[PDB]
Amino acid sequence: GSIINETADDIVYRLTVIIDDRYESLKNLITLRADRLEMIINDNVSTILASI
Amino acid sequence: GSIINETADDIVYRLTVIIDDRYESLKNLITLRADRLEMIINDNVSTILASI
Amino acid sequence: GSIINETADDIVYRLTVIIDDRYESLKNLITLRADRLEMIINDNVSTILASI
Amino acid sequence: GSIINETADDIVYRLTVIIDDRYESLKNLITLRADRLEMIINDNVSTILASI
Ligand SMILES: c1ccc2ccccc2c1
Ligand SMILES: c1ccc2ccccc2c1
């Protein structure tokens, strides 16, 4: 439209990309560490149960 | 308000919607995974106690 | 005048509050769920050890 | 080179620095608390396994 609403759209867009990238990083990390805890807990409990 | 004041509110508002959405996502993911770990732990302890 | 400088300062300042508030919320949530899980584990292990 | 194009670059950069700072803190927090939980889980299981 004009010079103002475009410069605003550019600010919103660029920072949105930043926010989105940092979001995905945190999302994948949370997922990664939670999967590890599940794996470790499962393996250990299975070891305990296998040890009378 | 003035043009620039309305444009400032719009930039903040839009990026706040973004930040909030991403925050809720991580908030929900963290809660989901932690809740599941507690579910897994509580179940495993019940099995270990049943196996004496 | 200087309204563009001030508005940019005003924009950065407002979104900083948003970002920091959500950060603290996630920081406390992550910290809270970790304390809970550690407590649950320690409690359960003591229960298991009390049952030979 | 424009009046507001530099302003936009400043706003995005200034908030990017803040986002990066908070993102890194959560990343470190998530890593540290998960590393801690994994240690606690294994240390506890070693105790149980050592109790017939
Ligand atoms: C601390 C670190 C990582 C986690 C992942 C999922 C749920 C809770 C957590 C607590
Ligand atoms: C997504 C990405 C980074 C963030 C940093 C702080 C608070 C919320 C966030 C949401």
Side-chain angles (χ1 to χ4, degrees):
Chain A
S2 63
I3 302 98
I4 299 295
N5 58 324
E6 280 182 292
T7 306
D9 290 350
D10 177 67
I11 293 170
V12 177
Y13 174 79
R14 285 199 284 170
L15 287 171
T16 300
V17 176
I18 300 297
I19 293 167
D20 283 352
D21 185 305
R22 308 304 182 277
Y23 164 73
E24 294 293 340
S25 301
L26 292 171
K27 168 172 159 290
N28 294 327
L29 178 59
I30 292 168
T31 297
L32 179 66
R33 302 315 306 255
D35 289 354
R36 288 182 55 88
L37 296 171
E38 283 181 31
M39 179 188 72
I40 294 164
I41 292 172
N42 292 335
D43 287 1
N44 282 335
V45 174
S46 183
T47 304
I48 292 172
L49 297 176
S51 304
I52 73 98
Chain B
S2 66
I3 298 297
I4 189 169
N5 183 82
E6 298 274 67
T7 302
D9 293 336
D10 185 60
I11 294 170
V12 178
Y13 175 81
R14 286 202 276 166
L15 287 169
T16 300
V17 176
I18 305 300
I19 295 163
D20 285 356
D21 182 297
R22 308 300 183 273
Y23 160 76
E24 292 291 325
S25 286
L26 299 174
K27 167 175 146 293
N28 294 333
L29 177 61
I30 293 166
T31 302
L32 181 67
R33 302 311 303 263
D35 284 343
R36 191 188 302 162
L37 295 167
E38 296 189 13
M39 276 194 277
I40 294 169
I41 288 170
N42 296 130
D43 182 63
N44 294 334
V45 176
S46 302
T47 306
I48 298 173
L49 294 175
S51 308
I52 313 304
Chain C
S2 62
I3 189 167
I4 291 176
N5 294 90
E6 295 180 273
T7 302
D9 287 350
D10 186 63
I11 291 170
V12 177
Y13 180 90
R14 290 167 68 182
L15 286 171
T16 302
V17 178
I18 307 303
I19 298 164
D20 186 68
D21 291 7
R22 308 303 179 276
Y23 162 76
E24 289 291 334
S25 302
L26 293 174
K27 187 201 75 177
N28 297 321
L29 172 60
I30 297 167
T31 307
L32 176 51
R33 304 315 302 259
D35 293 335
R36 281 182 56 86
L37 286 164
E38 294 177 29
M39 172 189 71
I40 295 168
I41 293 169
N42 291 334
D43 286 333
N44 291 331
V45 175
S46 301
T47 302
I48 290 170
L49 295 174
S51 304
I52 68 162
Chain D
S2 180
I3 304 98
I4 59 169
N5 296 22
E6 306 184 50
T7 301
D9 292 329
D10 193 63
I11 296 169
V12 177
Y13 167 81
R14 286 166 63 186
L15 288 169
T16 301
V17 172
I18 294 170
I19 290 174
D20 290 338
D21 173 285
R22 303 307 192 279
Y23 159 79
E24 289 291 335
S25 292
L26 296 171
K27 176 185 169 187
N28 184 34
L29 174 61
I30 294 167
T31 298
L32 287 173
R33 300 312 302 246
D35 286 350
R36 175 172 170 81
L37 278 168
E38 290 186 13
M39 177 190 70
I40 290 165
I41 293 168
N42 286 321
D43 287 355
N44 273 281
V45 173
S46 293
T47 306
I48 295 172
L49 296 177
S51 302
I52 53 171

